[PDB]
Ligand binder design. Structure first.
Ligand SMILES: [K+]
Ligand SMILES: [Mn+2]
Ligand SMILES: [Mn+2]
Lengths: 199, 199
């Protein structure tokens, strides 16, 4: 009934030196925790407004619902997209799809990096699956706007480019963070999400 | 709760020649009716998504909720803002507030006309009440985004500047529609809404 903060699947320092433990602890225990609690508060308000047929109240709650709900959706995926066992390249059908849709794994990395570096302000870069077209697709999302809820694409790999995802360690140089994060991508998880899209 | 299309407070031809009967009938029985019908469908989908804790579905439903819910809110106010007995100027505290906040009734008309003419695409011009500042305020809203739900201002008088509000009669010449609508403003209703803010 109530959304809950998932435990991080590894130690706060498991991704060093690529993402330091201070970032991981703040990002999970402060940023994500606030989204979950605030999401539950917003949902309860929305349920009351819906039962009363208060459309003005429903609409006034939309920014908080998308922001906190998206924050919960995005970070819950993000933690599983990273791993101390990550990095390198995927294999199997996901690697084949990457080569087919983007030319090569390196070209895909460049395209997702470009989308992630190109976010002006806060947001996310995504590798997604387009169910209707049956192929991979890159998109960027502002703030906490979640991929599937706002575009219909199924999320496979998300790169958080909010400043809190990198600033303590990499300061203003977002490209240094993007270079580092490729070393911890949990391709086992991305592959699982991809295979779940195909039937 | 099931939303319902409110009866129009007058005959479809009651606002002639300023807004013709064909427009009024289409606007109420087709456009507003569709907002009500689609709002009810969207609200039911939201009830299902809330019970399942499906945040992705909640967020995917937001555009339809704001569009149809806002359409229902906006048009329900709009019908009461007009009258066959309308036109002229308000009196009492509303006229005093208009003179105080905009300089004169004529200057207020210029400002609300300008905000309404300035909408690029579909939208609405509004005279609202700012509860925190305790004074009147003009704002424009895109599409069916409702005034109170998106800005907190209490709606007093709305001018629909979607093309369906005027096109059959005035074609591309939105300024002619804006000049004509002043002849049917129900200042009695605007006054009631204004006095309800100070009460
Ligand atoms: K360590
Ligand atoms: Mn984040
Ligand atoms: Mn309309």
């Amino acid at each position: 009934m109530k959304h809950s903060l998932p435990d991080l699947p590894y130690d706060y320092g498991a991704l060093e030196p690529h993402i330091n433990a201070q970032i991981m602890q703040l990002h999970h225990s402060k940023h994500h925790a606030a989204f979950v609690n605030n999401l539950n508060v917003t949902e309860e308000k929305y349920q009351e407004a819906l039962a009363k047929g208060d459309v003005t109240a429903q609409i006034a709650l939309q920014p908080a619902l998308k922001f906190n709900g998206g924050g919960h959706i995005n970070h819950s995926i993000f933690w599983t997209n990273l791993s101390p066992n990550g990095g390198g390249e995927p294999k199997g059908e996901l690697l084949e799809a990457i080569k087919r849709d983007f030319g090569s794994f390196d070209k895909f990395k460049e395209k997702l990096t470009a989308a992630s570096v190109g976010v002006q302000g806060s947001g996310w870069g995504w590798l997604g699956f387009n169910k209707e077209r049956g192929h991979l697709q890159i998109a960027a999302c502002p703030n906490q706007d979640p991929l599937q809820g706002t575009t219909g694409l199924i999320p496979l790999l998300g790169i958080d480019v909010w400043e809190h995802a990198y600033y303590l360690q990499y300061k203003n140089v977002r490209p240094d963070y993007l270079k580092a994060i490729w070393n911890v991508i949990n391709w086992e998880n991305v592959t699982e999400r991809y295979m779940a899209c195909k039937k």
